[PDB]
Amino acid sequence: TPVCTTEV
Amino acid sequence: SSYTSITKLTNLTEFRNLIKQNDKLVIDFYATWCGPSKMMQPHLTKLIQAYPDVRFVKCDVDESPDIAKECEVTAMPTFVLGKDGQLIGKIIGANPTALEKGIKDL
Numbered sequence A: 001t002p003v004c005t006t007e008v
Numbered sequence B: 001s002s003y004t005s006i007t008k009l010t011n012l013t014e015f016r017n018l019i020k021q022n023d024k025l026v027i028d029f030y031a032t033w034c035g036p037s038k039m040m041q042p043h044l045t046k047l048i049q050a051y052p053d054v055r056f057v058k059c060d061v062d063e064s065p066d067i068a069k070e071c072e073v074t075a076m077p078t079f080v081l082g083k084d085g086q087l088i089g090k091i092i093g094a095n096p097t098a099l100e101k102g103i104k105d106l
Helices: B012-021 B035-039 B041-050 B065-070 B096-104
Strands: B024-030 B055-060 B078-083 B086-092
Touching: B012 B055, B012 B065, B035 B041, B041 B055, B041 B096, B078 B096, B086 B096
Parallel strands: B024 B055
Antiparallel strands: B024 B078, B078 B086
C-alpha cells in the first residue's frame, strides 16, 4: 500500500 | 542535503512564516511508524538534490498535530506544495512519480 490513514 | 538533514517543523508560526518566505516549497508530512512514509525517504533525498530551487521540509504528524490539522492531513505521507506565499497543492501517498511531476510544475 502507499498510504497510512489515521482515524481519530 | 537529504531527508535526514532538512528542517523538521515544530511550530505554527514557523510553519506560516515558511510559506511566506519561500518561493517554492514542499512539506513532507509523515509518521515514524508508517511504512509508506519510510519508503519515501530515499526518494525525497533524490528530489532535494534534483530541485535545489525548492525548499524541502518535513513534519511529524504525531509530534506536531496542530500543523497537520492546519493542512488537513489525515493520511501519510502527504506532500504539501507551496508557491509564492501560499499553499497550492497536495500529493497524497507514496508516489514518487506524481510527486516529481508536482515539483516540476512549481
